[PDB]
Design a protein around this ligand. Structure first.
Ligand code: CK9
Length: 294
């Protein structure tokens, strides 16, 4: 739209390219996501319009939706940094536990809200967790996956990462639940603590096998109904569960307890966002400011 001047390429999501841009009338700086072309499904327009209404302090505000020349621009509030870059800048020191705790709590609030409206994120990852100078963190790209069912490649066919995908998605479950977001967030929590991705799979089977190697190969004892899943194979190798203090040292017992509940195989035993907010790990939660370099 002629109302915006591009400032710089922010990046390239699954659906299209993101630009930092300035509104010419009001002068606000925004992030513009440009999506491409059949006439744009009317279904997607309806669904994306309902996300305009999903407002919470821990969700990146969708300002406006412009459908033009049968093309789609999503206008978001702009944040100055994402968690992936903040993790990479904290690589040698690590993020302080109070700030990890604060970010985890805030995202759980975000998720509890979206989930109480039956909106799932579906593709949570450090690059879509955005942070500001005031100690906030926000969920970005919320509900877009459901608009048009995400593939495994982007617009120049860059790779969509599998590292945060819940096992039920990987095993072919079609009707997965809000629990998939909790799994992703657990994966991110572990990565903040250890400064290494928990399950860095480079294919779906490598992603599944990395999960199995750490958490044990799932069976009917831990996950009733698992062997009836579309992509479950009797022939999966049989790995025993590793002791869990091995996975996220030097995280304390409360954090390890929460993480373990976030990473339960069975989506029905996996902790809900609302329950997680009441976990003992957050008894002493605070809201520190990060020093950000912009
Ligand atoms: C490539 C798009 C992703 C979406 O999570 N990055 C990103 N970074 C944002 N900000 C962080 C950032 C700042 C400066 C340079 C790159 C960069 O990603 C951002 N602010 C609003 N949005 C909307 C589209 C959600 C944003 N999206």
């Amino acid at each position: 739209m002629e109302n915006f001047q591009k400032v710089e390429k922010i990046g390239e999501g699954t659906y299209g390219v993101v630009y930092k841009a300035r509104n010419k009338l009001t002068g606000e700086v925004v992030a513009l996501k440009k999506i491409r072309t059949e006439g744009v499904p009317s279904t997607a327009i309806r669904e994306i319009s309902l996300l305009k209404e999903l407002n919470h302090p821990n969700i990146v505000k969708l300002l406006d939706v412009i459908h033009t020349e049968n093309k789609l621009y999503l206008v978001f509030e702009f944040l100055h940094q994402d968690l992936k870059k903040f993790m990479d800048a904290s690589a040698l020191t690590g993020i302080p536990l109070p700030l990890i705790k604060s970010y985890l709590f805030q995202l759980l609030q975000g998720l509890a809200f979206c989930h109480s409206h039956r909106v799932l994120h579906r593709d949570l990852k450090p690059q879509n967790l955005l942070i500001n100078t005031e100690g906030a963190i926000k969920l970005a790209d919320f509900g877009l996956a459901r608009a048009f069912g995400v593939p495994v490649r982007t617009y120049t066919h860059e790779v969509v990462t599998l590292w945060y995908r819940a096992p039920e998605i990987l095993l072919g479950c079609k009707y997965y639940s809000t629990a998939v977001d909790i799994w992703s967030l657990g994966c991110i929590f572990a990565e903040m603590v250890t400064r290494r991705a928990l399950f860095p799979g480079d294919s779906e089977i490598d992603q599944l096998f990395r999960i199995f190697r750490t958490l044990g190969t799932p069976d009917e004892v831990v996950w009733p109904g698992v062997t009836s899943m579309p992509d479950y194979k009797p022939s999966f190798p049989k790995w025993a569960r590793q002791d869990f203090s091995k996975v996220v040292p030097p995280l304390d017992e409360d954090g390890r307890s929460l993480l373990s509940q976030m990473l339960h195989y069975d989506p029905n035993k996996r902790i809900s966002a609302k329950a997680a907010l009441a976990h003992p790990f957050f008894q002493d939660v605070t809201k520190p400011v990060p020093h950000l370099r912009l």
